[PDB]
Amino acid sequence: MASMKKKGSVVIVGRINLSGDTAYAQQTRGEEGCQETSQTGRDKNQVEGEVQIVSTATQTFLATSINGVLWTVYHGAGTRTIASPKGPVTQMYTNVDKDLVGWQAPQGSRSLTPCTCGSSDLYLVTRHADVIPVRRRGDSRGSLLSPRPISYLKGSSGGPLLCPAGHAVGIFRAAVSTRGVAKAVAFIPVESLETTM
Ligand SMILES: COC(=O)N[C@H](C(=O)N[C@H]1CCCCC/C=C\[C@@H]2C[C@@]2(C(=O)NS(=O)(=O)C2(C)CC2)NC(=O)[C@@H]2C[C@@H](Oc3nc4cc(OC)ccc4nc3C)CN2C1=O)C1CCCCC1
Ligand SMILES: [Zn+2]
């Protein structure tokens, strides 16, 4: 009871810059600063962009702002709070059946617009700033035009799938693996997010 620990907050440690003509990852906080920020829940670093790199004490993945909400996967964030300038912020969306959670998008971040193009030529943004062409194959599945080992997708859950116009189409959730090669991906449709809201 007196010994009972508390799980830490999710911490933004970087972002995927998509504003220029070349996408690249940027780190905003190191391991030591991340661990301390996770314990206190107070992150006073300025936030920028749409795709954040987030970390727990044991895991690192991505979070994407869509319509004023920072979305990520439940299997990464759990029910954890996210660190903010004023302290830990409680999740405003939690859906384990969709593998989806969400916080209020932090001040300074920019949001992606939900896609209404109905296009199936998608692009997956990974934590290493790779922009992978993906063809939509269903409501929540897509095939990589160039298959590659799952290692390249590890840590990219919560990242966006974009349409040709840059709209958000879904949130990267899982990789369909065949002998270690990711030929397909599963994602949370943007409409499923829009519903939850
Ligand atoms: C042939 O068999 C199969 O391949 N079958 C696959 C198949 O299972 N693949 C595996 C291959 C892993 C190996 C690495 C994959 C690489 C990248 C992957 C993008 C990422 C990712 O990056 N994570 S991460 O690194 O950021 C991390 C762990 C946060 C820090 N997702 C990812 O790792 C997924 C997490 C697990 O899945 C789910 N956990 C939960 C848990 C919940 O409460 C706790 C509630 C809902 C929920 N919902 C899931 C679908 C395993 N994950 C897979 O992707 C399909 C089968 C059909 C439906 C979906 C899964
Ligand atoms: Zn679109």
Numbering used by the authors: 983 to 1179
Authors' account:
The NS3/4A protease is an excellent target for developing DAAs against HCV, and protease inhibitors have been a key component of most combination therapies. Structurally Asp168 is a critical residue that contributes to an active-site electrostatic network necessary for efficient inhibitor binding. We rationally designed HCV protease inhibitors that retain potency while fitting within the substrate envelope to avoid resistance, particularly against D168A, which confers high-level resistance to current HCV PIs.
Inhibitors in the P4P5 series aim to further tap into the unleveraged part of the substrate envelope with a hydrophobic P4 moiety and a P5 capping group. Larger cyclic unnatural amino acids were also incorporated in the P4 position in P4P5-3A and -3B, P4P5-5, and P4P5-6. The cyclohexylglycine P4 amino acid in P4P5-6 yielded the most potent inhibitor in this series, comparable with the best inhibitor in the P4 series (P4-7), with potency of 0.91 ± 0.38 nM and 9.68 ± 0.64 nM against the WT and D168A variant, respectively. Six crystal structures of the P4P5 series included P4P5-2A and P4P5-2B in complex with the WT and P4P5-2A, P4P5-4, P4P5-5, and P4P5-6 with the D168A variant. In spite of creating a frustrated pocket, the P4P5 inhibitor series demonstrate a trend similar to that of the P4 series, in which increasing the size of the cycloalkyl P4 group led to better potency. Importantly, not only the size but also proper orientation of the P4 group toward the S4 pocket was required for better potency. When the cycloleucine was oriented away from the pocket (P4P5-5), potency decreased, while increasing the P4 group from cyclopentylglycine (P4P5-3B) to cyclohexylglycine (P4P5-6) led to a 30-fold and 90-fold improvement against the WT and D168A, respectively. The binding and interactions of designed inhibitors in the crystal structures, particularly those of P4-7 and P4P5-6, confirm the need for PIs to optimally fill the S4 pocket to be more potent.
